Coordinates of C-alpha atoms and ligand atoms in Angstrom, one line a residue:
Chain X
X1 CA 107.5 3.3 132.4
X2 CA 105.0 1.1 133.1
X3 CA 105.1 -3.8 132.5
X4 CA 102.5 -5.1 132.2
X5 CA 102.0 -8.5 134.1
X6 CA 101.2 -10.3 132.6
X7 CA 105.3 -12.4 132.0
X8 CA 107.2 -12.4 135.5
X9 CA 108.1 -8.0 135.6
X10 CA 112.0 -9.0 134.9
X11 CA 114.4 -6.0 134.6
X12 CA 118.1 -5.7 134.7
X13 CA 120.0 -4.7 137.7
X14 CA 123.5 -2.9 138.5
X15 CA 125.2 -4.6 142.4
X16 CA 128.2 -4.7 143.4
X17 CA 129.9 -4.1 140.0
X18 CA 128.3 -7.2 138.5
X19 CA 124.9 -7.2 136.1
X20 CA 122.0 -9.7 137.2
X21 CA 118.2 -10.2 136.6
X22 CA 115.8 -9.8 139.6
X23 CA 111.5 -9.6 139.5
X24 CA 110.0 -6.1 140.7
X25 CA 108.2 -8.1 144.0
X26 CA 105.7 -5.9 145.6
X27 CA 105.2 -9.3 147.4
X28 CA 108.3 -8.7 149.4
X29 CA 109.3 -6.9 151.4
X30 CA 113.0 -7.2 151.3
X31 CA 115.2 -7.8 148.3
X32 CA 116.7 -11.0 148.1
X33 CA 119.9 -12.5 146.1
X34 CA 121.6 -14.8 144.4
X35 CA 124.8 -15.6 146.1
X36 CA 127.3 -13.9 145.5
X37 CA 130.3 -12.6 147.4
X38 CA 129.9 -9.1 147.7
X39 CA 132.8 -7.5 149.8
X40 CA 132.0 -6.2 153.0
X41 CA 130.6 -7.0 156.4
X42 CA 127.4 -8.6 157.3
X43 CA 124.5 -10.2 159.5
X44 CA 123.0 -13.3 159.6
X45 CA 119.4 -13.0 158.4
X46 CA 116.5 -15.7 157.9
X47 CA 113.7 -14.8 156.1
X48 CA 110.7 -16.7 155.9
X49 CA 108.0 -17.8 152.5
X50 CA 106.2 -20.2 151.4
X51 CA 107.8 -23.3 151.6
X52 CA 109.1 -22.3 154.5
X53 CA 112.9 -20.1 156.1
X54 CA 116.0 -20.4 154.1
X55 CA 119.4 -19.1 155.5
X56 CA 120.6 -15.0 154.3
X57 CA 123.1 -12.6 154.8
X58 CA 122.3 -9.1 155.4
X59 CA 124.6 -6.3 153.1
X60 CA 123.0 -3.1 154.4
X61 CA 124.0 0.7 152.9
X62 CA 124.4 -1.7 149.0
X63 CA 124.0 0.4 146.3
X64 CA 122.0 -0.5 143.0
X65 CA 121.0 0.3 140.0
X66 CA 117.3 -0.8 138.7
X67 CA 116.5 -0.7 134.9
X68 CA 118.9 3.7 135.4
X69 CA 117.6 4.5 138.8
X70 CA 119.7 4.4 141.5
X71 CA 118.6 3.0 145.3
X72 CA 120.9 2.3 148.7
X73 CA 119.4 -0.3 151.2
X74 CA 120.0 -3.6 152.8
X75 CA 120.5 -6.9 150.3
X76 CA 119.8 -10.0 151.8
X77 CA 122.4 -13.2 150.7
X78 CA 121.8 -16.1 149.9
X79 CA 120.1 -19.3 148.2
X80 CA 117.4 -18.0 146.7
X81 CA 115.8 -19.8 143.7
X82 CA 115.0 -16.4 142.5
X83 CA 116.1 -12.8 142.8
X84 CA 113.2 -10.2 143.8
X85 CA 113.6 -6.7 144.1
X86 CA 111.8 -6.1 147.7
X87 CA 109.6 -3.1 148.4
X88 CA 112.9 -1.4 150.4
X89 CA 114.5 -0.1 147.2
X90 CA 111.3 -0.1 145.1
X91 CA 110.4 3.0 147.0
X92 CA 113.4 4.1 145.8
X93 CA 113.2 4.4 142.1
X94 CA 109.1 5.6 142.6
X95 CA 107.4 1.9 141.5
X96 CA 103.7 2.2 141.4
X97 CA 101.3 0.0 141.1
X98 CA 98.5 1.4 139.1
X99 CA 94.6 -0.7 138.8
Chain L
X1 CA 94.0 2.9 142.5
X2 CA 97.6 4.5 142.6
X3 CA 99.5 2.7 145.2
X4 CA 102.6 2.8 146.7
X5 CA 105.1 0.3 148.5
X6 CA 106.0 2.4 151.6
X7 CA 103.5 -0.3 153.5
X8 CA 102.6 -3.8 152.1
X9 CA 99.9 -3.4 150.0
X10 CA 97.4 -4.8 151.3
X11 CA 93.4 -5.1 150.0
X12 CA 90.4 -6.5 151.2
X13 CA 88.7 -9.3 148.3
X14 CA 86.1 -10.9 148.9
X15 CA 85.3 -14.7 147.6
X16 CA 83.0 -17.5 148.5
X17 CA 80.6 -14.4 149.9
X18 CA 83.5 -13.4 152.7
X19 CA 85.9 -10.9 152.9
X20 CA 89.8 -11.0 153.7
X21 CA 92.8 -8.7 153.7
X22 CA 95.2 -10.3 150.5
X23 CA 99.0 -9.1 149.5
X24 CA 98.9 -7.6 145.9
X25 CA 102.1 -9.7 145.6
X26 CA 103.9 -9.3 141.5
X27 CA 106.2 -12.0 142.5
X28 CA 103.4 -14.6 142.8
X29 CA 102.7 -15.9 139.5
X30 CA 99.4 -17.8 141.1
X31 CA 97.3 -16.5 143.8
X32 CA 97.1 -18.8 147.4
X33 CA 95.1 -18.1 150.5
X34 CA 95.6 -19.4 153.4
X35 CA 93.4 -22.0 155.0
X36 CA 89.5 -22.0 154.3
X37 CA 86.5 -23.6 152.7
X38 CA 85.1 -22.6 149.5
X39 CA 82.7 -24.7 148.1
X40 CA 83.1 -26.9 145.2
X41 CA 85.3 -29.3 143.1
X42 CA 89.6 -29.0 144.1
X43 CA 92.5 -31.0 142.4
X44 CA 96.1 -30.8 144.9
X45 CA 98.6 -29.2 143.4
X46 CA 101.9 -28.5 144.9
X47 CA 103.9 -25.0 145.0
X48 CA 107.3 -23.7 145.5
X49 CA 108.5 -19.9 147.8
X50 CA 111.2 -18.9 148.3
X51 CA 111.6 -21.6 150.7
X52 CA 110.5 -25.3 149.4
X53 CA 107.4 -26.8 148.4
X54 CA 103.7 -26.9 150.2
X55 CA 100.5 -28.7 149.2
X56 CA 97.6 -26.9 148.3
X57 CA 93.8 -27.3 147.2
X58 CA 93.4 -25.7 143.2
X59 CA 89.8 -24.1 142.9
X60 CA 89.6 -22.9 139.1
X61 CA 87.1 -20.2 137.8
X62 CA 87.0 -19.3 141.4
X63 CA 84.6 -15.7 141.3
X64 CA 86.7 -13.7 143.8
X65 CA 86.6 -9.7 144.1
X66 CA 89.8 -7.4 145.0
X67 CA 89.7 -3.4 146.3
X68 CA 86.4 -3.6 144.0
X69 CA 87.9 -4.9 141.0
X70 CA 86.4 -8.5 140.0
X71 CA 88.0 -11.2 138.7
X72 CA 87.0 -15.0 137.7
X73 CA 90.0 -17.6 138.3
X74 CA 92.6 -19.8 139.3
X75 CA 92.3 -19.3 143.7
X76 CA 95.3 -21.9 145.3
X77 CA 94.5 -22.6 149.7
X78 CA 97.0 -24.0 151.6
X79 CA 99.6 -22.8 154.5
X80 CA 100.8 -19.7 152.5
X81 CA 102.3 -17.3 155.0
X82 CA 99.7 -14.5 154.2
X83 CA 97.4 -14.2 151.3
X84 CA 98.8 -13.3 148.1
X85 CA 97.1 -12.1 145.4
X86 CA 99.4 -12.6 141.9
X87 CA 99.6 -12.3 138.0
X88 CA 97.0 -14.5 137.1
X89 CA 94.5 -11.7 138.7
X90 CA 96.7 -8.6 138.7
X91 CA 95.9 -8.7 135.1
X92 CA 92.6 -9.7 135.7
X93 CA 92.1 -6.5 137.4
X94 CA 95.4 -4.3 134.7
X95 CA 97.3 -4.2 138.1
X96 CA 100.4 -2.5 136.7
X97 CA 103.7 -1.9 138.2
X98 CA 104.7 1.9 137.1
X99 CA 108.4 3.9 138.1
Ligands
LIG101 C1 113.5 -21.7 140.1 C2 112.3 -21.3 140.4 O1 111.8 -21.8 141.7 P1 110.6 -22.1 142.5 O2 110.1 -22.8 141.7 C3 110.3 -20.7 144.3 O3 111.2 -19.4 142.5 C4 110.4 -18.0 143.5 C5 110.2 -18.5 145.2 C6 109.3 -16.9 145.4 C7 108.9 -15.9 144.4 C8 108.7 -14.4 145.6 C9 107.8 -14.9 146.3 N1 106.7 -15.8 144.8 C10 106.1 -16.6 145.6 O4 106.5 -16.8 145.9 O5 104.9 -17.5 144.9 C11 104.6 -18.4 144.3 C12 103.3 -18.4 144.5 O6 103.2 -18.0 143.0 C13 104.7 -18.9 142.8 O7 105.0 -17.9 141.5 C14 105.8 -18.2 142.1 C15 105.8 -18.9 142.7 C16 104.4 -19.1 143.6 C17 106.4 -13.2 146.1 O8 106.3 -12.4 145.5 C18 107.3 -13.1 147.5 N2 107.5 -13.5 149.1 C19 106.9 -13.4 150.4 C20 105.4 -13.2 150.0 C21 105.0 -15.1 149.9 C22 104.0 -15.6 149.4 C23 105.3 -13.0 151.0 C24 104.8 -13.4 152.4 S1 109.1 -14.8 149.3 O9 110.5 -14.6 148.3 O10 108.8 -15.3 150.3 C25 110.3 -12.9 150.5 C26 111.2 -12.1 149.5 C27 111.4 -11.3 150.5 C28 111.0 -10.8 152.1 N3 112.1 -9.9 153.4 C29 110.8 -10.3 154.1 S2 110.2 -12.1 154.2 C30 110.7 -12.1 152.6 C31 110.5 -13.6 151.7 C32 109.2 -15.8 142.9 C33 109.5 -17.2 142.3 O11 110.9 -22.8 144.0 C34 110.7 -24.2 144.9 C35 112.1 -23.7 145.9

């Protein structure tokens, strides 16, 4: 579909057997999601933006479904104020910017 | 244009008569540029990102050309990690997400 940007581009995602809401975020290199206790191993990581850095857990090869489109990639989990779908997954669903 | 997301969606902008590079950021409500000199009045504002809040200078009704497309709107100037074009101006240039 086509999503205009008058409001935040929020969509429903499915991850770890749960449904969440997340922003389609072209300014996010990586995908960063609210605290959730996903199974399996992870690696510590720090990601930075406006205001500084936060500590997150990096999970690899995670299946996510975004508006019915399936993707598989790295997800960062931690105390983020907003769930964002980053370019690592947006490319996999064929998302482009158009003007 | 149609812009894929395998790389960062960086474009050239013109503001205050100066060329800069900025990131088309659908996750940003507002447009935030690194420290620079802009003519005219400004008001202090606070904005919040992934790591907390920062202080910025709010410039209203500023002319800015983004990848050949003109906008006139609010530009925030302060210690952002990178120049970002947010939805307040992405809407002005007719930018949508598509997949
Ligand atoms: C409950 C609400 O909490 P909140 O208000 C903050 O909420 C939000 C927090 C973050 C966002 C998304 C964030 N937008 C943002 O900063 O936008 C500012 C300006 O416009 C305003 O609108 C929204 C906030 C204000 C960017 O799209 C993406 N970011 C990187 C960019 C930084 C500008 C480029 C470097 S990233 O997230 O830092 C990030 C993501 C993946 C990644 N992989 C490796 S690094 C790395 C860094 C949206 C809402 O309170 C504060 C605690």
